[PDB]
Design a protein around this ligand. Sequence first.
Ligand SMILES: Cc1c(O)cccc1C(=O)N[C@@H](CSc1ccccc1)[C@H](O)CN1C[C@H]2CCCC[C@H]2C[C@H]1C(=O)NC(C)(C)C
Lengths: 99, 99
Amino acid sequence: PQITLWKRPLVSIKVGGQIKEALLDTGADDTVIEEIALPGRWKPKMIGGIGGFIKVRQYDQIIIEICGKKAIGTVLVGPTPVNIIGRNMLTQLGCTLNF
Amino acid sequence: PQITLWKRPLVSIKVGGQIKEALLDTGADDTVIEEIALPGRWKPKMIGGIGGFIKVRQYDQIIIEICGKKAIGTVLVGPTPVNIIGRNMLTQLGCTLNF
Ligand SMILES: Cc1c(O)cccc1C(=O)N[C@@H](CSc1ccccc1)[C@H](O)CN1C[C@H]2CCCC[C@H]2C[C@H]1C(=O)NC(C)(C)C
């Protein structure tokens, strides 16, 4: 489909067995989610937002349902205000910006 | 045009009589540019995100240009690591998200 930007592009997602609200974010390289339990070993990571950097746990090959679709990739977990679907996941969905 | 997200969706914009590079951000409610001279009076504003909050100057009635298309609205000026074109401007350009 086509999503307009008159309001925040919020969608429902399923990650780590839970349903959540997330933001389709072309301004994010990564997909980051509030504290949640994911399987496997993680790696440390720094991501720089508008107010500076923070540390998050990096899990790889994590499954996520988004827009009746599935994306399997890197998911960062940390103290984020909003759950974010970054470009690494958006590209798996075949998202493009059009204007 | 149609922009893919394999890499950051950076584009050239014409703002404040200046040509700058900025990121088309569907996750940003607002548009914020690094230090730049703009006409009119401003009001202080705090915007937050990953990493915390920063202080910015809010200018209204600012015109910007991206790929031959123009839009007018509010532009925030402050210490941002990357220039962000938010939804307040993306809508005016007829920018949508497709998949
Ligand atoms: C989450 C993330 C990554 O994993 C990797 C790179 C950047 C980001 C990141 O924070 N990107 C942001 C743009 S600010 C930005 C900073 C550096 C580079 C590019 C953009 C988000 O797209 C938008 N971001 C989405 C969201 C992040 C959690 C807090 C609530 C909003 C805040 C909003 C935001 O920051 N809005 C402003 C108006 C202050 C610009």
